[PDB]
Amino acid sequence: MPDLLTNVAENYVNQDLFAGIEWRIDQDGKPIFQGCAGVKDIETRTFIPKNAIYRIYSMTKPIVSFLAMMLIERGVFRLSSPIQNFDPRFKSMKVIDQHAHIEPATALITIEHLLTHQAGFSYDWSLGCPISAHYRDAQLIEDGGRDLTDMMGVLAELPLVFHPGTQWKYSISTDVLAHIIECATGERVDDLLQRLIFDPLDMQDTGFSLPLDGASRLMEVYGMRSLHGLPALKPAPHVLVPADLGSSHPTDDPDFRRGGHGLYSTLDDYMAFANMLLSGQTPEGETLLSPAVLKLALAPRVHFGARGMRINDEPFAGYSWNLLGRVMTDVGAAAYATHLGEFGWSGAAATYFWVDPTKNMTGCVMTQFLGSQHPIGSDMQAAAMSMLG
Amino acid sequence: MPDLLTNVAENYVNQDLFAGIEWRIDQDGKPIFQGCAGVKDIETRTFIPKNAIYRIYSMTKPIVSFLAMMLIERGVFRLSSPIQNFDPRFKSMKVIDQHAHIEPATALITIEHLLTHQAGFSYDWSLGCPISAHYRDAQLIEDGGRDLTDMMGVLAELPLVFHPGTQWKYSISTDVLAHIIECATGERVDDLLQRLIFDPLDMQDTGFSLPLDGASRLMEVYGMRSLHGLPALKPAPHVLVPADLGSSHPTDDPDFRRGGHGLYSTLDDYMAFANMLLSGQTPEGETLLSPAVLKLALAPRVHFGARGMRINDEPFAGYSWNLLGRVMTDVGAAAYATHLGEFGWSGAAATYFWVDPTKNMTGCVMTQFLGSQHPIGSDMQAAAMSMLG
Amino acid sequence: MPDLLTNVAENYVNQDLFAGIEWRIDQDGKPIFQGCAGVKDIETRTFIPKNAIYRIYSMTKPIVSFLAMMLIERGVFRLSSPIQNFDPRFKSMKVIDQHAHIEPATALITIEHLLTHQAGFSYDWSLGCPISAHYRDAQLIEDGGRDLTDMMGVLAELPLVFHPGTQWKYSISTDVLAHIIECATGERVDDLLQRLIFDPLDMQDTGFSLPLDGASRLMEVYGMRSLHGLPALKPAPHVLVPADLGSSHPTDDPDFRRGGHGLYSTLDDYMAFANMLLSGQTPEGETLLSPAVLKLALAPRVHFGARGMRINDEPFAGYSWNLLGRVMTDVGAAAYATHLGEFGWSGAAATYFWVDPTKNMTGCVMTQFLGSQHPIGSDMQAAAMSMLG
């Protein structure tokens, strides 16, 4: 009944844990709760501008994944398509294990494997991983100025950490997908996103570079988590100190494009995307994805054992994985308020969104903190859940 | 009747695979086969000098292990002694797995665990290892100028890769043993080795630094294998190019001391040590280790399922592990000529020795190649085995 | 050549870890090493007297077990005899588990089960045990003044902790054996021991009460370990403070008799028993037990997976169990010097003995410390092993 959302966000700002936070909850495609708290940057305490811009990191993945589903619907490829059909550099993959043994992969990587993170790829920042050291040496995440096509050439020469289709590990595979989309179509992934998703949804501030007037609107990013350094043995301390992104996340590189991170967006833009996921249609009624293929993309596809879904051993309790991200499959295992079928994803700088079809509800929290020790996205979802039906 | 040993070594020299090779095989404590082939260095083509000096790398381990057995016999500690009793920096160890999960160790590391490589330590060069990236970042092997005591403090804060006692992995644990020996005795490991082993066995050219007249006797070392760089996905090419040791292996540092590598020795010196291992006595009959404790040290202690004993996935077929190194426990699984109970070890620069109690036989092959694709040590053992009756 | 035995014992005395220590090692039935160190008691610093008397605790078990083998040879009962045939109070046993479930035993307890500690009994001091709380409440070990026959009636109504024959747990079962011996023979176990073992072996100072001149010869007992109190979560601190035995171990009760503890003995007396175990004969050549039944008693009978043989989680590495105690079955797993087939047992006050058939060797260490953190018995065996050739 009281506004738990504002309370959560104001407490985080007042405890000096986050610089600035924006949130919006829509129901039936219209805002029902919204607010902001804090400032654009604590150094000058500049107020959060109108249409503040955020680095959404892994919230890029549902967008690129949705684009893949559109291309499957249009016949460009299918879930079962081997990616080596589109880029022969991914022929003849190898598999490494924790006992130094390397052998050829016993199955081809498919489009579906990329969308489900069952291809066997890993991540530069994966702690304890048998291959992440070679990712870091390759500077896969560090070297943002390298063209997607070239970075994929370097990645393709490295071994996987399991045979495709046999396990789940959250990975660089959405970046492979963006690249394979380019191979399959002959077009650039950022142009396809613009034409097929952002323009029809009027997401005018979303892209891999800042808009013309965007520099003054870019929220400052804080925190000490590194997505490319030696993986930390203990979580980095939660200090509101500006983050050094190196050259991993350029603001004005016209060729920078990725599958797993890199988009800039706004609260309003991402809510347009999240609302569309309730139906596969634009507010006007243009179909971006038929109901049948949307159902195909949202249905629980990867199920987890008693350890559950985990990323660097952090749990996603009661969640399974579908073609676009997480999906709640057991409220009795959930660690925070939700409903069966709630889905979405989140980003490394603590951006978070959800879609709850049982309530016709979408929600998004925007902030900039790399390596939060406080799960603000889940706290805000829980607050909104408590305030609705 | 043919001199198979000379044929093997000369073929290796003539095919430009090794620069220079010395070998000697003793029976009943007297040479029966010996020879040399090639040169000290291919750059100047200097002949192998008298009392040529070799970096024996991991052939340091049987010597430091034998020292530990001597201290056990003398009551300094015992196999079951928790190492944390002597260095509390090894209290409260953690264990990391390949899925980024870290938890406290469920058992204390003992002296026996160090000697059997069942402590859970790893190595900077371990391919696919969940912790070797942190070893490399800490420069454990790279930084040879760092004092043993300080290197151990850095190592002690890293997690293990399994719970002590529960698995086998060839590791930096002999270096921990050398350090713990220093803590238990209040003496330095090089002084203990000198007084307890080298002096009684007349091994006057063996130590962690060169003798005063040793620079002209030091064999050049070739090969591309690195013991501290990013672990290679495929074996480095076998080319006779001088190896760059960086600061990993100083020649004249009076404080350099280690347990798993770092000794310089000669063929003659190592053969004195090997011959002693047939009895636990000097040639004059002075006991260095009682028959009972030598038997305890040589009895098969770690057995392998499956795939067998492996180091970076390279097999040691038919070998089990005892407190000093490998021991042949199944001739029917051996990959090269041997007898039940043959034991010994080898070094990363391709030095190799064996002790064959059924034949009162010892053998040693000295050469300097880091990362051989050719198992010269085993070829020479096989040739010597074939030359007996 | 150095007297390692004296070095071990004197270090223990000088470090205030033990008050007084006696030892003797025989070969071919004649002493080869012997000595003593420290005092009878640190309070008055009286020297260890001639024929000093020790509470040997669980070194009672090999003696009572040997008595059982003698009665088996004489046809009194056999290994497969159900004990309920002799005391029907042990009909209809129950079994309790760690989940509070109780069910009837699915097998009868046999004489063999008692001798191998596979009957399902436990001990008052067993840490974490599903039944030891009821042992303590019943005061089985605490109440030394209670007659053996009555103690067994109380014990017989408690559940076992596994089904007879199916597991190993060191237990009060030797006391049940002593009781069943009394039921089967119609005689008292102390009278049987006197006539069948002590008198033929001239062990005139061994019994459940002190000899008339024994008060001045009784060694003082130190240490904090309790065999009947709430089981300690961490080992009691090793301090030389006199131990309070309560009424658990009377000196002059003419009816006190037990199977698992309670005998007083001397170094000389126990060495006569140990030497007999090399042959089954007195020194004069009278047979106490035939070679065939001695072999039956010494052959490895219980094998261990894992973790191995453990008592309150303390390991007996490389040891299996036979009908009289431990037996070394794998030198490659042993934690201290020994030979295949070495056998014997030890007591809670740190008395220790061994028989080594391969060396025609016996040894015994007598001291009085309840709850040592230092395995003096094994240190002395190791020293003696190291002093042979």
PDB file of C-alpha atoms in Angstrom, chain B residues 3 5-6 9-10 20-25 31-38 48 54 267 364-366 380:
ATOM      1  CA  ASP B   3      74.797 -49.551 -27.679  1.00  0.00           C
ATOM      2  CA  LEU B   5      71.828 -45.628 -25.428  1.00  0.00           C
ATOM      3  CA  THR B   6      74.381 -44.030 -27.743  1.00  0.00           C
ATOM      4  CA  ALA B   9      71.296 -39.791 -27.838  1.00  0.00           C
ATOM      5  CA  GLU B  10      73.194 -39.389 -31.120  1.00  0.00           C
ATOM      6  CA  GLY B  20      73.999 -31.975 -25.522  1.00  0.00           C
ATOM      7  CA  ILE B  21      73.186 -35.122 -23.533  1.00  0.00           C
ATOM      8  CA  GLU B  22      75.021 -36.981 -20.768  1.00  0.00           C
ATOM      9  CA  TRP B  23      73.992 -40.323 -19.333  1.00  0.00           C
ATOM     10  CA  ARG B  24      75.227 -42.875 -16.841  1.00  0.00           C
ATOM     11  CA  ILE B  25      73.737 -46.172 -15.690  1.00  0.00           C
ATOM     12  CA  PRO B  31      78.971 -47.536 -13.833  1.00  0.00           C
ATOM     13  CA  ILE B  32      78.100 -50.077 -16.522  1.00  0.00           C
ATOM     14  CA  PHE B  33      76.974 -47.676 -19.281  1.00  0.00           C
ATOM     15  CA  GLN B  34      77.828 -44.032 -19.779  1.00  0.00           C
ATOM     16  CA  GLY B  35      78.382 -41.516 -22.503  1.00  0.00           C
ATOM     17  CA  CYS B  36      77.724 -38.079 -23.868  1.00  0.00           C
ATOM     18  CA  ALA B  37      76.629 -36.585 -27.168  1.00  0.00           C
ATOM     19  CA  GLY B  38      76.493 -33.128 -28.671  1.00  0.00           C
ATOM     20  CA  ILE B  48      80.245 -30.776 -22.845  1.00  0.00           C
ATOM     21  CA  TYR B  54      72.394 -28.739 -15.216  1.00  0.00           C
ATOM     22  CA  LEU B 267      75.389 -36.179 -13.637  1.00  0.00           C
ATOM     23  CA  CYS B 364      70.344 -40.640 -15.071  1.00  0.00           C
ATOM     24  CA  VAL B 365      69.991 -38.583 -18.265  1.00  0.00           C
ATOM     25  CA  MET B 366      71.117 -34.936 -18.158  1.00  0.00           C
ATOM     26  CA  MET B 380      67.074 -43.710 -22.527  1.00  0.00           C
TER      27      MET B 380
END
